[PDB]
């Protein structure tokens, strides 16, 4: 089989991957408690590589930034200690794990919230109800409280804390989840940010709690173990943009400065990458819609330096592999996405017979 440029190795700030497929950050909701369980040490195992990237499904950094059922969180001892044989069992194969640490904002209900506070948001709006995964019981959200602007920093504070708690349960590195309509997106988008302070009002103002974000957790472990997701071009959440290829613009050339490990960007569903590409200057991950012909594609036409694949890659462990041996893939099966069982749809998806 001929060499394809996804099998390439790429160097990735103080890393050296030995391939460019990315285990895109997968919410599985199998965290019972909101602790990382046995049966993850083992999903994340099958799909680990030697000198492969892994990102691992968003990580809530506190009580507040809960808004599903048994995600995982990383603000808390037990949390911390039930993390170490899970990044142990990918360090066993070689691979390069991030945490993807995670507050959800405004996309929560104060059933989920401590002492049945309201959730926090840039804005005091709440989300319309949405169809849950399964067709037919609806999620509704509670209008979320505004943050005041004192209380801000200590939200930053959350994340940097998070970080730190990632490096201590052995975590290569951390990723900030600045997308899909999630806490950090709520500020960045104008659909969403309607404040009046210096949170709000401007691009800059509106990517100010972001980049304080990535300035903290940067300033805690090092840059170079820093990465950041953004989706300008999302609306999921009823997080749009007026102008999103001015917003993604802003926020590749503000990064930077800061000499990340990366920036991964979600495709846009006459929107395009590719000047944000052109204007970061580091390693860009791009994810949304890929396949292995759109994967090398992508590398060939020099529009990415990473590609990171979700449903692929939970229905194939083995998924930089097959794309090596250019070999079938399985079908991915929606309806266990977001089940609980410890295995169906988790870790019962075959490898390379
Ligand atoms: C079941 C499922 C869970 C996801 N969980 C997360 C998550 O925790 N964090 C995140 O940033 N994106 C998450 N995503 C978005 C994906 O990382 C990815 O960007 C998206 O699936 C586009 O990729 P694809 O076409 O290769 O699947 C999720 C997607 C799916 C389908
Ligand atoms: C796409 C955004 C994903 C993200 O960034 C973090 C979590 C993902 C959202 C999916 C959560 C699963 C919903 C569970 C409720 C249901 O069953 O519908």
Same mark, same amino acid.
């Given at each position: 089989v001929?060499?394809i440029?996804?099998?390439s190795?790429?160097?990735?700030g103080?890393?050296e991957?030995?391939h460019?497929?990315?285990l895109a950050?997968?919410?599985?909701?199998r965290s019972?408690?909101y602790?990382p369980?046995?049966?993850?040490?083992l999903?994340?195992?099958?799909?680990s590589?030697?000198?492969?990237?892994?990102?691992?499904?968003?990580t809530?950094?506190?009580?507040?930034?809960?808004?599903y059922?048994?995600?995982?969180?990383?603000?808390?001892?037990?949390?911390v200690?039930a993390?170490?044989?899970?990044?142990?069992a990918?360090?066993?194969?070689?691979?390069?794990?991030?945490?993807?640490?995670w507050?959800?904002?405004r996309?929560?209900?104060?059933?989920?919230?401590?002492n049945?506070?309201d959730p926090?948001?840039?804005?005091?709006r709440?989300?319309?109800?949405?169809?849950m995964?399964?067709?037919?019981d609806?999620?509704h959200?509670?209008?979320?409280?505004?943050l005041?602007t004192?209380?801000?920093?200590?939200?930053?504070?959350? %994340?940097? =804390? $998070?970080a730190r708690?990632?490096? /201590?349960? @052995?975590f290569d590195?951390?990723?900030?989840?600045?997308?899909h309509?999630?806490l950090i997106?709520?500020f960045?988008?104008?659909?969403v940010?309607?404040?009046?302070?210096?949170?709000?009002?401007?691009?800059?103002?509106?990517?100010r709690?972001?980049?304080?974000?990535?300035?903290a957790?940067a300033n805690?472990?090092?840059?170079?173990?820093?990465?950041?997701?953004?989706?300008?071009?999302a609306?999921y959440?009823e997080?749009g943009?007026?102008?999103?290829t001015?917003?993604?613009?802003?926020?590749?050339?503000?990064?930077?400065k800061?000499?990340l490990?990366?920036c991964?960007?979600?495709?846009?569903?006459?929107?395009?990458?590719?000047?944000?590409?052109?204007?970061?200057?580091?390693? %860009?991950? =791009? $994810?949304?819609?890929?396949?292995? /012909?759109? @994967?090398?594609?992508?590398?060939?036409?020099?529009?990415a330096?990473?590609?990171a694949?979700?449903?692929?890659?939970?229905?194939?462990?083995?998924?930089?592999?097959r794309?090596?041996?250019n070999?079938?893939?399985?079908?991915?099966?929606?309806?266990?996405?977001?089940?609980?069982d410890?295995?169906?749809?988790y870790?019962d998806?075959?490898?390379?017979?």
């Amino acid at each position: 089989v001929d060499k394809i440029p996804l099998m390439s190795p790429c160097k990735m700030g103080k890393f050296e991957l030995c391939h460019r497929v990315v285990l895109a950050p997968l919410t599985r909701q199998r965290s019972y408690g909101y602790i990382p369980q046995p049966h993850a040490i083992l999903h994340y195992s099958q799909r680990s590589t030697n000198g492969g990237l892994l990102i691992g499904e968003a990580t809530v950094i506190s009580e507040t930034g809960i808004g599903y059922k048994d995600v995982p969180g990383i603000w808390t001892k037990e949390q911390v200690e039930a993390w170490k044989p899970i990044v142990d069992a990918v360090h066993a194969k070689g691979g390069i794990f991030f945490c993807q640490i995670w507050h959800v904002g405004r996309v929560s209900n104060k059933d989920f919230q401590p002492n049945g506070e309201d959730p926090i948001s840039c804005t005091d709006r709440g989300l319309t109800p949405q169809i849950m995964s399964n067709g037919i019981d609806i999620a509704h959200f509670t209008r979320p409280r505004r943050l005041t602007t004192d209380e801000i920093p200590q939200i930053v504070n959350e %994340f940097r =804390v $998070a970080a730190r708690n990632a490096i /201590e349960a @052995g975590f290569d590195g951390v990723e900030i989840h600045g997308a899909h309509g999630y806490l950090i997106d709520q500020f960045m988008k104008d659909q969403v940010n309607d404040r009046s302070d210096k949170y709000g009002g401007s691009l800059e103002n509106r990517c100010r709690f972001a980049l304080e974000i990535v300035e903290a957790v940067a300033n805690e472990i090092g840059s170079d173990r820093v990465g950041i997701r953004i989706s300008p071009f999302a609306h999921y959440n009823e997080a749009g943009d007026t102008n999103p290829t001015a917003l993604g613009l802003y926020m590749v050339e503000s990064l930077n400065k800061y000499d990340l490990a990366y920036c991964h960007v979600v495709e846009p569903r006459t929107e395009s990458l590719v000047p944000m590409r052109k204007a970061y200057k580091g390693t %860009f991950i =791009v $994810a949304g819609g890929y396949d292995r /012909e759109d @994967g090398n594609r992508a590398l060939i036409e020099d529009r990415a330096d990473l590609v990171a694949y979700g449903r692929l890659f939970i229905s194939n462990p083995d998924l930089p592999k097959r794309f090596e041996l250019n070999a079938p893939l399985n079908k991915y099966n929606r309806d266990t996405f977001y089940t609980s069982d410890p295995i169906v749809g988790y870790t019962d998806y075959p490898f390379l017979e």
